Amino acid sequence: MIYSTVNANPYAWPYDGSIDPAHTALILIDWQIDFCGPGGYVDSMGYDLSLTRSGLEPTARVLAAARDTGMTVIHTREGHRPDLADLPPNKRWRSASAGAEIGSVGPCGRILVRGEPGWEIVPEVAPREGEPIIDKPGKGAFYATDLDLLLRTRGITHLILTGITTDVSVHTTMREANDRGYECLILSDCTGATDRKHHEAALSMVTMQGGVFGATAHSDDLLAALG
Amino acid sequence: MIYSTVNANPYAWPYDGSIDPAHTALILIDWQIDFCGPGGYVDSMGYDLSLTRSGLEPTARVLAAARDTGMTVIHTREGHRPDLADLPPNKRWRSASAGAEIGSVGPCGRILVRGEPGWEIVPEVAPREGEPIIDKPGKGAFYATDLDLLLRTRGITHLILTGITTDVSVHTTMREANDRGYECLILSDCTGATDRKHHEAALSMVTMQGGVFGATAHSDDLLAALGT
Amino acid sequence: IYSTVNANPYAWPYDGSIDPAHTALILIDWQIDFCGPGGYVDSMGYDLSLTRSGLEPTARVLAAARDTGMTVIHTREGHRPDLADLPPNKRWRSASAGAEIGSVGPCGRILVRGEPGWEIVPEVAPREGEPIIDKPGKGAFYATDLDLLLRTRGITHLILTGITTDVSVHTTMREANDRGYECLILSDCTGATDRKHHEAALSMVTMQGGVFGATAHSDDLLAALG
Amino acid sequence: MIYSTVNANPYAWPYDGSIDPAHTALILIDWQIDFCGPGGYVDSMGYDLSLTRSGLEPTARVLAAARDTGMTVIHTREGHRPDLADLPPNKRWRSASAGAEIGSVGPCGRILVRGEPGWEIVPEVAPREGEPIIDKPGKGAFYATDLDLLLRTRGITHLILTGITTDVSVHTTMREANDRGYECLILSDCTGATDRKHHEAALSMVTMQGGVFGATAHSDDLLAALGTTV
């Protein structure tokens, strides 16, 4: 009912020496076809989907352990209002430049638009009632959302991060959370990027200055702490 | 005077195809002894200061052009209130773990405390009157500050980013800006990290997906586009 | 580009004209929960005629904003059906006033997203291209994307309608003003649970040369728009 | 250690049945010459300083009770960077319209500029070390400040509000706090406005809907509760 530290890089996580489920949230970031599925945004830009998809089954196991421990669980979906009123023109222009324009029709509907097949959370990690979903127009889950209000009213102080991609939406969310004083763990095997060297360097960045953004861990080490 | 695009990775920056100094700000991030000087935070943790100091002279040249062209200039200092009311305990404990506890007395005073010698902006990139200084308790310049009010008040839409470190305060500040729709350039030779691989990987991360966080460039290509 | 409005206490806006391309009409919380029988405000026993008098004037201002092509944004106060965005003090006060957020009344669960009492009333129904803000608080900025929507469209100027004058409208004006938005509040397109609070909310705006912006009757805006 | 509720309007404050100093902050809002002093912004606009000053003596006594019980104490100053980079032009234009332009030289230096005599907290409620000061460029204490960071790192859940003016900075701070889930008390005698009717109407707005922004009380009712541990 109170858990020990996780074997983590570069310190035994978290810093206060124990994980309380009543103050800990598992975050699942952007597990959507647009980031890890055929026909979606990342696929249409020519990136290797095996680099993102490897995180899925490890994440499913960590989601069951969080449900079993009564951790809070929060899901994120990167996406835009169908009218695109939350889409900066630079973001739109780059997506067109990369051959996968946000709001344009691809094999999985309108790219990164809320309500579209490619925007949905994949079945492997489907949310259930009582696990709030953040709909974010940005990479960072804090910006232009109610996330911080959801975390503060639940008294959350500790975040465990899974999702995609490691260097983009996961790292942005970790950095925003860290600046607010949240104690964050990132799971090396439940994340993935458009480039394996970016995945590795993003985990590596976390570990400097005695853990500038938190700690990294394998899901095996978290499942071990959770019993 | 408006200027054409910078030769950048992965697109000719900015996306809208001109640089207007009325709408552009040069950001100098955390050029402090604590991040690039003997006796400070980063030195005390045992990292190599030459990795952070190489960006100083190139930054001073970009600062000269930015003041030349009439674009706004904004400076940042990472630091805490002397009473540490703005210091999360996890940030404090990790700094102790690394051998350089925030608030502890080092060779340049209380480490990362506002008012202390190690927290001062180094003279090579000293601020002038009318160039606002951001005091931030975090790595991101937008969290717990007035930066967004300063930028919206001057009508800024475009940021040129310099300072340290590439993968920590610079990247966080770039990520925060980018999500609000600021168009951002990061200068490869005017930034630096506690690790060369982290600096290089931080620059490259920007360039993916057609420029997910904006674009990278050498100060040479910025100074060419400005006609300096 | 349109002329200034005959406003209190200066000719609004401060920069001397209204550009539809930089102006948004905001319609705040026109929901059965705030102005309709069977909703939150009715359940607390407040007088609905105080809130409902602003409706037909708002409809008229909504038509003039649509005709001039300015941005239109609507707000709905409401909570996630799981109530993860509901502070315990807000819930507790609502229970205390005999209309608990989430409790079932004639119009479904009070102040819950998806429920009949939460919907925007038809007299000011939104149309395509008019973004709706879903807010868990009185202020339209807190825990929403409102500021992203406005900044992306280049909005500098807000015209404020909706209910109530002293709660959600005043909070939203105070938030927008502090960010440097130039705000007009329409006296006849707002209403409160108390006439004195309505009038006092409006005069608070007019102090110190217009501390939060300016007040106007919809007639004065429509005269400016014509 | 833990204290009884306050006899407040419209419920015995706070909603969770007791006051814990470990989780409660006293906030002192904008007790500056520019709002309550001769030669300052409000004086230069022609408003009656007796309306703001009356709150000063009861505030000193509440400040004393807060420091005695070991509550957190936070002070705010409304003000602008000397370069005016945080000053929206509509704010400046209204101040010039009202005959007291922000940044302009008056009897107490540059009006509402940080570092100037008019801007200083007045000596009756001077901060001590360990009581953070918030420098805000707006009326609300949360916008473009670290206040939320200070409050959350200290585990503060409950606010007691004093300061000026009741209808501007104090109300705006209260609305911001309340929306984020903070439980707030506004002290009727430790606040004041440019208009008595605005002060009274600012306090009764709080009381509607079972206490839409929190509750109101007299310093006497607060001081009674702080003499009654449970």
Author numbering:
A (entry chain B): 1 to 227
B (entry chain C): 1 to 228
C (entry chain A): 2 to 227
D (entry chain D): 1 to 230
Pull text from the paper.
Biuret hydrolase (BiuH) hydrolyzes biuret to allophanate and is part of the Isochorismatase-like hydrolase (IHL) protein family within the cysteine hydrolase superfamily. TrtA is a member of the isochorismatase-like hydrolase (IHL) protein family, similarly to BiuH, and has a catalytic efficiency (kcat/KM) of 6 x 105 M−1s−1, a KM for triuret of 20 μM, and exquisite substrate specificity. TrtA and BiuH are members of the IHL protein family that possess the catalytic triad comprised of a cysteine, aspartate, and lysine residue. Interestingly, the active sites of TrtA and BiuH are almost identical in sequence, and so it was hypothesized that triuret is the substrate for TrtA, funneling into biuret metabolism.
